[PDB]
Design a protein around this ligand. Structure first.
Ligand SMILES: O=c1c(O)c(-c2ccc(O)c(O)c2)oc2cc(O)cc(O)c12
Length: 265
């Protein structure tokens, strides 16, 4: 009654997400439904961890989707979220346009880095960083992180649980069912960057992940290749920090989001 429901944006392991409008001020929103029995992790009154995590990051402005409100139903939780318009997720974007120019990929990747740092600084680990979980505000050139349904509170001890996307998961998970948050995040960022500049992910099978050998199907600069291979180092301790990523030569002279939209969008 407080929101006007529109068409279904998408569904999957995360639940069902509808387009909507806040009747109060015609604010475009996204309405996400999550069935309770399909929830594995809870936090605190007890709610999905997703709600806990979103609240920890929804303060201030950032490249993270904002949680505006939420409700509890008998068999589900309903999430009212920010909705950019016009919008397109990075997966569909790369699908339509193919591999992105490095200038565009630099801008996008930088914004993802800023958003991930924001989460970590707020005590939140996303655990499912990938193209499908990134929205593009096509007019402003701003990227937003979505779907914290597989995330966790950030800790410095080892994780033994994972329900993110396998082809983005690090070799230490595939092999030992153990990983640490930051180093595992950096791996997925390596997969993401490759996806941006090559138009597809580098590894499909478990053994390809374990081997960690990167082949470039597209013309990619030596500096970008180096950063990717660095992020995808087999030993977690050999992976760069976020600081080392953003101070990498390939990450210099990033375009502002608005410049990015004007030139590329
Ligand atoms: O605006 C959108 C939105 O906020 C989300 C979203 C947010 C948080 C979640 O936890 C989640 O699973 C999805 O999905 C979308 C999917 C689309 O195709 C288009 C959109 O505009 C949105």
């Amino acid at each position: 009654s407080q929101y006007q429901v529109g068409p279904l944006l998408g569904s999957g392991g995360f639940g069902s997400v509808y387009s909507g409008i806040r009747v109060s001020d015609n604010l475009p929103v996204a309405i996400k439904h999550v069935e309770k029995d399909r929830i594995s992790d809870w936090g605190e009154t007890r709610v999905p961890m997703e709600v806990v995590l979103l609240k920890k990051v929804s303060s201030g402005f950032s490249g993270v989707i904002r949680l505006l409100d939420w409700f509890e139903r008998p068999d589900s939780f309903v999430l009212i979220l920010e909705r950019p318009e016009p919008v397109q997720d990075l997966f569909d974007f790369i699908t339509e346009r193919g591999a992105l120019q490095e200038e565009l990929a630099r801008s996008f990747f930088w914004q993802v880095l800023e958003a991930v740092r924001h989460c970590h600084n707020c005590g939140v680990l996303h655990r499912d960083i990938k193209d499908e979980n990134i929205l593009i505000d096509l007019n402003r050139g701003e990227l937003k992180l979505i779907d914290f349904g597989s995330g966790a509170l950030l800790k410095d001890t080892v994780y033994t649980d994972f329900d993110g996307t396998r082809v983005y998961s690090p070799p230490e998970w595939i092999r030992y069912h153990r990983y640490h948050g930051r180093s595992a995040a950096v791996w997925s960022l390596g997969i993401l960057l490759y996806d941006m500049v090559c138009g597809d992910i580098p590894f499909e099978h478990d053994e390809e992940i374990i081997r960690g050998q990167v082949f470039f199907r597209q013309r990619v600069s030596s500096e970008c290749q180096h950063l990717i291979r660095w992020c995808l180092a087999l030993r977690p301790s050999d992976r760069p920090t976020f600081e080392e990523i953003q101070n990498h030569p390939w990450m210099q002279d990033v375009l502002l989001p608005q410049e990015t939209a004007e030139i590329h969008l």
